[PDB]
């Protein structure tokens, strides 16, 4: 299985024959396509489980959970597909799942139905970080959907921030050419040459994009259908683009981002190709 | 244009070269694949316009609007494609359209014309213009009002569809509900089960038909709620209850269960085919 092969090539721990990632290995696995396995896979010990407890115990509960965990944590393979589906699938399906797994419409599940959720997503021994975080140190607890959904949103925020620092190349701001590089990342070579013909010559360096403006673009990405039809209503210029994004997403967008995407896609915007490139990610 | 072909041979009025339906011609156009044009197309006169106004004045604003209108009203071609996509496309696009058209959560007549042009490519005053923008074309249409109009029209079409398959009566035997479900649809084995293991027991009420009809709109959520089982009647009823939010009468579930040999993918293949 290709997914499990990848999970294994990013796994640092092993026990009884089933490999485990660390939070650092998970972040590495979403952020880098490959990495040099310079060290063998050490086997799991009891200092590592106690480290799993301590890390949760001293980590932030928000957008810095996984980074604050560092190497103190464990993630099984099913939990890794689970987290992958948080980052790549819409959240309403999870609300449907919670409403089909809960007892007496309480919208709260215990640890066993969390196991069965990962079995269902999987086919489609020890206690891990997610079990200790959602449920008890000892399974004392049950996971309400509100808690779990703000966990999903926090993890998405985390991955967004680390993507920003990756394309900022460590610094606090992101030049508009690095935003253009990030937008056209999954585009093939031909179209990238056509767009880089535009950026190459008429995208200037002015302001540099903040993390919050990147996050604003990221919230605009989630309302692409409404925006797509609001565009199909149109001849489309910057005032009309800004209005269309403002009513299709509710979000005011920073002049740097609009300038960048307008000068990539050309005094009229080529929104057919713009949204074709967007929906590929 | 083939859609214009249909609109034209269902049209009863004409003017200046532009053909117009009455509300009855529209309903007939949604309910019957064909009809014999027995009468010629008449020229539009002023008694028809004042009849449109009066018909609007003495009609219900809810689920009986078009049937209460009868022949006293007119519907342009652009308005006919407009109403057709109201019945076959989701409604959120209309909300984004409204907020792309307003200066206030409200649209004027000019922007309604714009909307019928955009929906079209996707002189006289008609029924919809007088209803939304008044006799005088100077009113404004709030999105809530118009969404009430869409839901009321869908209710209307549901009621007339029920009366079509109930064949005039107040209740619908399970066999005619199966007739409606399998209309556009392996087809023999479905008809083998309704014939021998469907007990023409209770009859399906109109409200339970409407419940199934609104369940049809949450088919994706239901698909995931079904993929959670990885089979029985309580589990199917729970899945419909959380996928649509809404309790369903045991009568319909019995019918759909014995039609489809209680593997839900095939059932939803038949459903999403309409």
Curated annotation (Swiss-Prot), chain B:
Changing residue 238 to E: Abilished interaction with MICU1 and ability to regulate the activity of MCU. Keywords: Disulfide bond, Membrane, Mitochondrion, Mitochondrion inner membrane, Phosphoprotein, Repeat, Transit peptide. The modification Phosphoserine is found at residue 120. Changing residue 71 to R: Does not affect its ability to regulate the activity of MCU. Changing residue 24 to E: Does not affect its ability to regulate the activity of MCU. One of its GO terms (cellular component) is mitochondrial inner membrane. Ca(2+) 1 binds at residues 102, 104, 106, 108, 111. Coiled coil: none annotated. It comes from the Eukaryota. GO terms for biological process: calcium import into the mitochondrion; cellular response to calcium ion; mitochondrial calcium ion homeostasis; mitochondrial calcium ion transmembrane transport; negative regulation of mitochondrial calcium ion concentration; positive regulation of mitochondrial calcium ion concentration. Changing residue 227 to A: Decreased interaction with MICU1. Calcium sensor of the mitochondrial calcium uniporter (MCU) channel, which senses calcium level via its EF-hand domains. MICU1 and MICU2 form a disulfide-linked heterodimer that stimulates and inhibits MCU activity, depending on the concentration of calcium. At low calcium levels, MICU1 occludes the pore of the MCU channel, preventing mitochondrial calcium uptake. Belongs to the MICU1 family. MICU2 subfamily. EF-hand domains 1 and 4 have high affinity for calcium and act as sensors of mitochondrial matrix calcium levels. EF-hand domains 2 and 3 are degenerate. This is Calcium uptake protein 2, mitochondrial. The chain holds residues 84 to 394 of 434 of the full protein.
């Amino acid at each position: 299985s290709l997914r499990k092969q990848r999970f294994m090539q990013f796994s640092s721990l092993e026990h009884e024959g089933e490999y485990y990632m660390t939070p650092r290995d998970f972040l590495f696995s979403v952020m880098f396509e490959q990495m040099e396995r310079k060290t063998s896979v050490k086997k799991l010990t009891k200092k590592d489980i106690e480290d799993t407890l301590s890390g949760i115990q001293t980590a932030g509960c928000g957008s810095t959970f996984f980074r604050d965990l560092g190497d103190k944590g464990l993630i099984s393979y099913t939990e890794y597909l689970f987290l992958l589906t948080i980052l790549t699938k819409p959240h309403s399906g999870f609300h449907v799942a919670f409403k089909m797994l809960d007892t007496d419409g309480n919208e709260m599940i215990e640890k066993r139905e969390f196991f069965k959720l990962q079995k269902i997503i999987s086919k489609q021994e020890i206690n891990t970080t997610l079990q200790m975080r959602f449920f008890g140190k000892r399974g004392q607890r049950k996971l309400h959907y509100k808690e779990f959904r703000r966990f999903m949103e926090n993890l998405q925020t985390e991955i967004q921030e680390m993507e920003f620092l990756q394309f900022s190349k460590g610094l606090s701001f992101m030049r508009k050419e690095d935003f253009a590089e990030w937008l056209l990342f999954f585009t093939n070579t031909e179209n990238k040459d056509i767009y880089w013909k535009n950026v190459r010559e008429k995208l200037s360096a002015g302001e540099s994009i903040s993390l919050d403006e990147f996050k604003s673009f990221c919230h605009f990405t989630t309302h692409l259908e409404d925006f797509a039809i609001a565009m199909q209503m149109f001849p489309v210029r910057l005032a009309e683009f800004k209005r269309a994004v403002k009513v299709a997403t509710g979000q005011e967008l920073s002049n740097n981002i609009l300038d960048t995407v307008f000068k990539i896609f050309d005094e009229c915007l080529s929104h057919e190709e713009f949204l074709g490139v967007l929906k590929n990610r």
